[model samples]
Target: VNSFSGYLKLTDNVYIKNADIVEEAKKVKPTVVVNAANVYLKHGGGVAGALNKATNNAMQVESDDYIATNGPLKVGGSCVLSGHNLAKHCLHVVGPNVNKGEDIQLLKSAYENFNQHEVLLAPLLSAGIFGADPIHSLRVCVDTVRTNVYLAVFDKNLYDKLVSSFL
Candidate 1:
């Protein structure tokens, strides 16, 4: 379990906190919901799964069709998908699979995909099954994001550590 509601403001229009990202993504009313998607945009789990569920499974179909049409994305690559329900569109950006090596630069590049959105909501990319150190992942998100974006942290330990360290 996690906080799932509260948020802490840091820099202007930047927030870090625990939230039900799927629920929030559905209603946060951002121009595009940013998904830390896989290279093939598979709705396997984590952020990708949530967006899929939010769109009532249409998101995954779009992902399949997207790959069939345009082929798989490279890490730090990006594409746009229909949000279907509330969020008008979803920005699917593949983040690093950090188990390999220094994924920091790739992560930074993945974050750059957020530039097109005025308002956005995103998960702590690579922090979950992607195998990033959760603390480092959150720090990167805090450091990399521009404009208005909320970091919807799913890791309970990550949230506790954030509060213990800074909040």
Candidate 2:
């Protein structure tokens, strides 16, 4: 595993770490970051909450505007917004709910929309609040993210597991 700036490279261009996503965003300054939003584009909890805080709650305002103009987004769908208080761009992804089957393809599609970037920071899609396993969540993100992916893990134990898996 390759380690840099506190992240462990689990695979080619796929890195993982146990750290605060917002802090990392400030240091890494990735081209884009993903926000786990519901279909309605509400950035309330989980990664969305952290993003909302870092972006000075700009995420909520932009998300509301997006919904106003484009209507509600579908699960697995994504929309790009100005990272007014965070990265260069913020991608909002609608994750599957607890009872719904995990839709990795849909998650991938969202990341695919921003695949042109050189670096992208994201959390384990559907792992938190949505109740998906952290390991499975990381796998889904790794499979779909097209560019150099840096995954933020809030749990230290989960981060260790991810590193071991790579080895």
Candidate 3:
């Protein structure tokens, strides 16, 4: 029997939880986790900052390799966090600085980079620090559903809004 038996189903392929992302990350055990970062790969703010702490700065260090080669990343460009922490890998993408719904398309394109991975953990992305509306952001994420998803939102109200609007 698979040790991950009951936890494997995607449950409509979109799971939303209001829990600590790092703690919940351990339980779900996704193949990859994604964080919204700036072009500089600095994890000093928002979800990127939290992930930096969780992975013991592994994300930040791994990010350097990408930054070195690519210079500043595009809106949808991403790089992997090799193999570290709970997830086997991590995908870091630059979040849009502001939104007019265009960031939804950008975020959707970023998801395409790692859709090959079986499972993924992501935040609402661009919704918090980047100032995208939560409802639209969650819809964009849910719409790009080639892989199973575990979406963690720190704000209870935002989580509820996501559920009501899209899930």
Candidate 4:
């Protein structure tokens, strides 16, 4: 049997899913897909790379233009982009690159910037590249998000880690 069953519905609106975020985004077709972005909103790898593929690299080009105009976003800042292949739009929010006293606050701030989307597919930010504790990311996401958000985990290990933490 699988370690995880279907979904972990933490709240009426929030859900935890151990699956590919890109595929989930394609299926749910949420209003927007959230990118676990860097300050530059550069679509280079990880969640950003998959989103870049889905958007046919247009979001990357758009991000370039955005940075040129406004410079890079600070941690917890966000921007929206046009033309998502899986959703109506794309929302990119940067999380803290370091896990110190304010990491959770920064992640919460990032989550707070989520705009008018009713439902959005989002990944566990700062957990990978920025080296945040997965549970911390998950908790901040659960505590902060008001809108319907599916937390996507690409790796089975990460899936197990987050799920087991609750048990």
Candidate 5:
């Protein structure tokens, strides 16, 4: 079992200290829910790829519902495209290698679209690929998403909590 050995904080807020993410969700009225489950590793794109892989069919996704691209590494490329294709929507925030600052930009984008939708499914922010320390990665991640966004992480490792909010 993966232990929370080094993860316990010296906080007095017991509710927050020992709380589940869904339970915390009840405390706030969420505008959108986003997941950051290593979007490109398995699903590769986002909601569209997720839906396609989950259903084993080619689903046409509206431009707004999904965001993807070549990478911040490559300049002037498609931001998003079909899950199984190259450069589509290149310039936005699709991932190749994300720097620390991009995380902030990502959160801004999410907030900008908050009112337009009830929930947003974002993928998990990966660290092994991005060279981010675990906690730093976690902080940059949750800090960027607005309070209204109920972040969800759709990942393979059944139970993973990278932040207090993900508790």
Candidate 6:
């Protein structure tokens, strides 16, 4: 009865959007979006400094309505902070045991947000983080955003540094 009758399972339709969930977005018209904004290195610790700075920058953004899935965000750890902050709900998902494909999972999580109508903000998914080897993570991340919700990304300060260093 549906366009994806044979290709999809009943649960897949019940869950809403995912990495490739966008392909069938026309059918669902989801409203929320999710973004996996973070960095990765040959190892995980390399991005600690940048992630710290970014988390701070995000804290200062105009809205307080954001939610982080993995763990408590270090920025608004204090209970008094306002603006309806969301990422304050959790911590960053990390470590190599998670593998590169984790980016896909993050994107999928972000999509859940889109279905809920949340415009998500994230950084770190840029080149040095998860975009190096499995570039599809970036595409899937972007696609999940485009298909399900609004996505705003961080400026590439890291990229600018590389260019500035050479000059």
What number of clashing residue pairs does each candidate have, in the order they appear? 0, 0, 0, 0, 21, 23
Tell me the TM-score of model 6.
Answer: 0.30
Error of 2 at 150 (Å): 0.8
Q: Rank the candidates by lDDT, best first.
A: 4, 1, 2, 3, 5, 6
RMSD of each: 3.9, 2.9, 3.3, 4.3, 10.8, 13.7
TM-score of each: 0.86, 0.86, 0.81, 0.86, 0.35, 0.30
lDDT of 4 at 165: 85
The Cα RMSD in angstroms, rounded to one decimal, for candidate 5 relative to the true structure is 10.8
lDDT of candidate 6 at residue 51, scale 0 to 100: 32
**Residue-wise lDDT of candidate 4 within 36-127, one digit each (tens)?**
88888778887888888877888888889989999999888888876367777778889887743345568788888663667777888787
Off by over 4 Å in 3: 1-11, 99-104
Candidate 5 residues 14-108, lDDT tens each?
Answer: 11122332322223323222322233323354433443443344323333244333322121122333322211111122322355334533433
TM-score between model 5 and native: 0.35
Against the reference, the lDDT scores of all candidates come to 0.75, 0.75, 0.70, 0.78, 0.32, 0.30
Give per-residue CA lDDT, model 3, range 62-109, as digits (tens): 778777877877787777765367677778776576844445567777
**Model 1 per-residue lDDT tens digits across residues 88-118:** 7888888898665546679878877877777
Q: Against the true structure, whose lDDT is highest? A: 4
Clashes of 6: 23
2 or 6, greater by lDDT: 2
Q: What is the lDDT of residue 154 in candidate 6?
A: 33
